[PDB]
Design a protein around this ligand. Structure first.
Ligand SMILES: NS(=O)(=O)c1ccc(-c2ccc(/C=C3\SC(=O)NC3=O)o2)cc1
Length: 290
């Protein structure tokens, strides 16, 4: 890591602490993640992720395994979507830019998922934007590569807000549908400027989903009632109208949102099918203010 000088701490993610760093030789500016953890399995899986390249994924530039420590060197981008959404809390992100961001993120997901790689932990903090109007998925593949956690190294309440309902009901063998769910939630949030399902615990997370989309049953989700953490004793709320949930959004957008928020992960739209949705007939690539 001595080939790097630390500039600033960009944050403390699930996998330890991220610094903006300068490669003390090249002059190149990067994001340096020291992994807070040596297992051979993780090294191989991490090495496989280095070959994933797509303009919508933040590039894993170098994997440095030294002094039994793991450093991950990532392409550095200047902002994430959280700060960008905070900055424009008062005006709104204009819809064409929302749409552009949604279309490119789904492209990232289509690519990753075509490789059987999933994120599992998408959130606005993982979505990185530049001045050219690009948006990129960070931390793809890391969950499966390293193992999946409770509270972070920051001793921080991590984000269940974007968690798919099959994960919350204790499914061990979930699929790429979990990422579409999370993107669905982030799409809604961009539109309304408020988190769609801001749970303060796992059952509150699940109940906030139930209260808006209705309590799932065998009709909408075959197999639901025999999932590990499902309880017959769950309250039985009715589904709300999406015109109430993401109120200003047009019918193309809400129809797409609804396919991304299907309970049944096999009914839930693929990233590839979502790219052909009518919402994107008029997509463009606007550039943000920044
Ligand atoms: N809060 S901020 O908008 O100033 C900001 C946040 C993140 C990054 C940034 C650039 C590159 C990375 C790499 C990341 S983010 C993550 O969650 N895991 C990474 O490796 O993170 C830059 C600015």
């Amino acid at each position: 890591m001595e080939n790097f000088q630390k500039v600033e701490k960009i944050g403390e993610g699930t996998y330890g602490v991220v610094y903006k760093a300068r490669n003390k030789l090249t002059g190149e500016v990067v994001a340096l993640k020291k992994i807070r953890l040596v297992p051979s399995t993780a090294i191989r899986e991490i090495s496989l992720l280095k070959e994933l390249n797509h303009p919508n994924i933040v590039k894993l530039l170098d994997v440095i395994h030294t002094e039994n420590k793991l450093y991950l060197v990532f392409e550095f981008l200047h902002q994430d979507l959280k700060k960008f959404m905070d900055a424009s809390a008062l005006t709104g992100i204009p819809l064409p830019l929302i749409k552009s961001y949604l279309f490119q993120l789904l492209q990232g997901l289509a690519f990753c998922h075509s490789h059987r790689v999933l994120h599992r932990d998408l959130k606005p903090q993982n979505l990185l934007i530049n001045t050219e109007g690009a948006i990129k998925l960070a931390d793809f593949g890391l969950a499966r590569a390293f193992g999946v956690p409770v509270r972070t190294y920051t001793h921080e309440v991590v984000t269940l807000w974007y968690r798919a309902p099959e994960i919350l009901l204790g499914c061990k063998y979930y699929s790429t549908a979990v990422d579409i769910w999370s993107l669905g939630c982030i799409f809604a949030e961009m539109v309304t400027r408020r988190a769609l399902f801001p749970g303060d615990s796992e059952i509150d997370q699940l109940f906030r989903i139930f209260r808006t989309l209705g309590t799932p049953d065998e009709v909408v989700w075959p197999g639901v009632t025999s999932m590990p953490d499902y309880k017959p004793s769950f309250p039985k709320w009715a589904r709300q109208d999406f015109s109430k949930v993401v109120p200003p959004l047009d019918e193309d957008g809400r129809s797409l949102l609804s396919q991304m928020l299907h309970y049944d992960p096999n009914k839930r739209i693929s990233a590839k099918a979502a790219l052909a949705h009518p919402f994107f007939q008029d997509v463009t690539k606007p550039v943000p203010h920044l």
